[PDB]
Amino acid sequence: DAIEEKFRERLKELVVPKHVMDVVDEELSKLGLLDNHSSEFNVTRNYLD
Amino acid sequence: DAIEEKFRERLKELVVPKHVMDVVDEELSKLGLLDNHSSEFNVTRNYLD
């Protein structure tokens, strides 16, 4: 939530396209499914940022 | 199955050839064996999309 929500309020200011909206949100969903420890999750985390 | 289910209603409208039908079916099952988080699952996910 921490990183996700600072980026979410980020997202709340800039008007993202609905395409990019669902992409960032589903990538956030994959963040939630991906475990925090995985290097795969570090890649998607760096990607989210 | 969530992703495969939106895919399968998709396919329920447009009429696929039985060739590509069976191909997507075996790929769908092959996806279903695949882990929910594996990198190759993401590849076959994007591919099935």
Keywords:
78% helix; motor protein; 3 helices; part of a larger assembly; 2 chains
Walk me through what this model shows:
- The structure is cut from a larger assembly and holds two copies of chain A (49 residues).
- The first copy, chain A, is an all-alpha fold.
- Chain A has helices at residues 2-13, 18-33, 39-48.
- Chain A has three helices and no strands.
- In chain A, helix 2 runs antiparallel to helix 3.
- At the A-B interface, loops of A face loops of B.
- Chains A, B: It comes from Homo sapiens.
- Chains A, B: This is Lon protease homolog, mitochondrial.
- Chains A, B: It is found in: Mitochondrion matrix.
Q: Summarize this, please?
A:
Chain A has 49 residues and is mainly α. Helix content of chain A is 78%, strand content 0%.
Main sheet attributes: strand count, strand direction, barrel closure of chain A: none
Cα Rg of chain A = 11 Å
Oligomer: part of a larger assembly
Largest interface: A-B, 5 and 3 residues
Number of helices of chain A: 3
Q: SSE order of chain A, as H and E?
A: HHH
Given helix and strand content, the structural type of chain A is mainly alpha
